[PDB]
Structure 1
């Protein structure tokens, strides 16, 4: 069964794996360590983007507003922000796009400053009925993934439920929900993670992330050919795998979870 299959992957890879497959309405279909805490790493950028879109929905932000920065704001991984820095800004829209599809860390920090910092993302999670997910630091130190530390964590089930609300539920405006979904489908960083374990015929959007101590995660929504809608969260710590094997591990978990998608 699912429990034994995932436990076998853990032992074989000397990894810790947390996974939740949920339906459109947030109900757990299959899970393993689904309520244990893992570091978000870059997966937090999905609900962050949703918070910024929600602020645009509410008239508190403009998609074309210029978020100003200089070279000192750059991060080691910030491919878009490095290109825009001579102009002195990225727009809210550019920062959302870049944070989601490239995982740009300076763009993410621009958004975190825009929303009022990590505590305001925690507040947003709480507002959605997510009692667990929390952001505490900005890039890059939110990635430390230290044992016993609850900063910057989620659980597979809480994140999957939160994502299902944003992607399939009524929380965002029709416009913002579409923008978020299409951005995630166009993610550039997830071709070898959850997507690689699902049929190519299915619509998939996702947000990846990696952390210290071998953390590598992905959260995806997908829609089957039959039109059945799901969210799959996969959180892993696999310190003895190399990066490509960590992606393959995620794909392997997705393949196992895929057998519980009914036609």
Structure 2
């Protein structure tokens, strides 16, 4: 039984696990702790890129953004290198999704603009998609640090899956912008050991990960069967029992995804 398997994984990893797969043509929704809040961590970068794409003409991708030494405040594998040159909006989107670059995401939040360095506008974008649950309150590095249970900087597996479904499968974005987001997630470099590890190689997987303090490890994905039937998969986890420095455990997500894949096969 799925719920039993998910509970077994929680015990194995001393973790809290949340899973949501929306209902489809012939499958019921899969849900486990799906309405409990979990920190977004870097998963917010996927709808962030959607918001920036939606907000602007496509060629806003070519706008060069400049920044400085004091802007590097978080893991930023790509932006660390381009302080002098600056990065285009398209480069920032690419880095935010594919390398989970924190500076890139902070700069995208500032591009979106408005109160809270862009976090209010980000939240407003989610509200426009019918998500009355999620909230972003801080940028990097703070957004990954809220104590377990705190509602700041949280979503739920259910909420984020419905958002991702609209962005990738539905009509939240026009086809050209939708393809940009989809391709960046398809080319993600950080997800090999999470949802991807749970699905057979002949399933397509696109995803965006997040990792945070208190053992936080998330992954949100869209997967397509070998015959092109898509499913949205959100898996979220934390390990409050280990305190702030608890190690995130990717294997928990790989195992959860393997269980989901077994049901969807």
Normalization by structure 2: what TM-score? 0.92
Q: Which runs of 5+ in 1 are unaligned?
A: none
Superposed counterparts of 1:144-155, under 5 Å? 144-155=145-156
Aligned residue in 1 for 2:236: 235
Helix, strand or coil for the counterpart of 2:62?
Answer: coil
Structure 1 moving runs of 4+ over 4 Å: 239-243
Distance 1:54 1:24 in 2: 26
Name the CA shift for 1:152/1:92 in 2 (closer, same or farther; >3 Å): same
- The answer to whether the Cα contact below 8 Å between 1:222 and 1:231 also exists between their aligned partners in 2 is yes
> 3-state SS of the aligned residue for 1:132?
coil
In the alignment of these two chains, the number of paired residues is: 256
Aligned: 1:254 with 2:257: yes
Cα distance, 1:60 vs. partner?
9.1
- Alignment check: 8 A CA contact 1:28 1:157 kept: no
How far, CA to CA, are the matches of 2:191 and 2:6 in structure 1? 21
Structure 2 match to 1:75: 73
Aligned counterparts, 1:18-37, within 5 A: 18-23=18-23, 29-37=29-37
Q: Which runs of 5+ in 2 are unaligned?
A: none
User: Secondary structure of the residue that 1:230 maps to in structure 2?
Assistant: strand
CA contact (8 A) 1:23 1:229 kept: no
Please state how far the C-alpha of 1:76 moved relative to its aligned partner: 3.6
The two structures, once aligned, show a CA RMSD in angstroms of 1.7
Whole-Å separation in 2 of the counterparts to 1:250 and 1:44:
18
Residues in 2 aligned to 1:233 and 1:178: alpha-carbon distance in whole angstroms: 20
Is the CA contact 1:145–1:215 (under 8 Å) kept in the aligned structure 2?
A: no
Match runs of 1:4-153 below 5 Å? 4-23=4-23, 29-56=29-56, 59=57, 62-87=60-85, 89-116=86-113, 117-153=118-154
Range moving further from structure 2, 204-213 or 6-15: 6-15
Structure 2 counterpart SS, 1:10: helix
